Each structure stands twice: as C-alpha cells, then as structure tokens.
Amino acid sequence: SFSGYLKLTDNVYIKNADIVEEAKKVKPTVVVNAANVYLKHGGGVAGALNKATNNAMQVESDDYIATNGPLKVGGSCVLSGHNLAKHCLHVVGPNVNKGEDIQLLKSAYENFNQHEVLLAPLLSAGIFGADPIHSLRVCVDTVRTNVYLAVFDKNLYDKLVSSFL
Numbered sequence: 465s466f467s468g469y470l471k472l473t474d475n476v477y478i479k480n481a482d483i484v485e486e487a488k489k490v491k492p493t494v495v496v497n498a499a500n501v502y503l504k505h506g507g508g509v510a511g512a513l514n515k516a517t518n519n520a521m522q523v524e525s526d527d528y529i530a531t532n533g534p535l536k537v538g539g540s541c542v543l544s545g546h547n548l549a550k551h552c553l554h555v556v557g558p559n560v561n562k563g564e565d566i567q568l569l570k571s572a573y574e575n576f577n578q579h580e581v582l583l584a585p586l587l588s589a590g591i592f593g594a595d596p597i598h599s600l601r602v603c604v605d606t607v608r609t610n611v612y613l614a615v616f617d618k619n620l621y622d623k624l625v626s627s628f629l
C-alpha cells in the first residue's frame with residue numbers, strides 16, 4: 465500500500481512526493497486531481513496527471529464536458545484513473561487567482577468523504593493561490609476518510625509538518 469507517509473491525524477497522512485510518481489507506484493483506487501470547472505488539465509497537478517496518461521485524461525474529460533457541461537467550484541466528478549489509479553476524482557477547489565471564494569474549499573474537500581481511501585494533493589494550493597497551511601487545516605477538519613496527501617515541494621512539506629497543530 466502507501467509507504468513513507470507521516471501520520472497527521474486518525475485519517476490524514478502526508479508525504480513529500482510527486483503525486484504522478486506516487487500514483488504510478490501505488491496504483492490507488494482513487495487519485496484526486498486538482499481540477500478546474502472545465503477539466504482543462506493545463507498545469508499544476510492537473511497538467512502533470514494528464515501528461516502521465518499521454519493526454520487520455522484530457523480526451524476523456526473533453527467528452528465529459530461536452531455531455532455534462534462544466535463542474536461547479538467545490539464540486540467533483542469521478543472519471544477513469546487511466547494508468548495511474550482505478551479512478552480519478554476530479555475535484556474543483558476555489559482558485560484564489562480567479563477571485564473565487566476560499567470558503568468553497570470545505571465543500572471541495574467534502575467530495576473526498578465519498579471514497580474510503582484516496583491519494584490526493586492539497587486542494588487550492590500551488591497555482592490555485594490559496595495558503596497550503598489553511599488547505600491542510602480544512603482537509604484535516606473536513607475529510608473523515610483515509611487521505612494520503614502528496615506534497616510536491618520539499619520546503620512546503622517541511623513547513624506544513626512543522627506548523628501542523
């Protein structure tokens with residue numbers, strides 16, 4: 465299963481790892497994507513996950529959007545995990561660099577509660593512009609299922625562990 469994770473709470477675990485590499489090694493049941501409402505996987509975790517699937521995630525996502533329209537900020541959809549996981553849970557956290565309401569981050573993490581175990585990034589962190597310390601706090605206070613967080617940046621991982629209440 466998952467290895468080298470630091471236990472933060474009863475159900476939240478954290479590791480300094482590349483989520484693509486982590487997904488390829490573990491092949492978890494669910495890998496969470498840091499998605500946008502259009503499922504346009506251009507950069508960040510989304511761009512990296514999509515590139516690992518040889519663009520198959522984008523082709524599948526475009527068909528999903530053509531049929532269903534965009535997701536809501538705070539919402540999600542379950543699609544194939546391709547070569548990375550059984551499923552990919554595309555979760556839309558608020559993008560602070562788009563003026564989106566940071567209060568929607570709790571709604572975004574609530575999507576994780578529909579899955580017993582997930583490999584995930586910190587929602588709204590990185591290119592989404594939110595404070596990753598706040599995202600970890602919302603994660604631990606919202607997610608009740610087993611979440612294994614992959615934090616790409618070593619310096620951010622150290623700051624998150626060292627400042628964890």
Ligand SMILES: O=c1cc(Br)cc[nH]1
Nearest residue numbers: 483508509512590616
């Ligand atoms: O290129 C990337 C970006 C993020 Br964030 C995580 C993994 N790889």
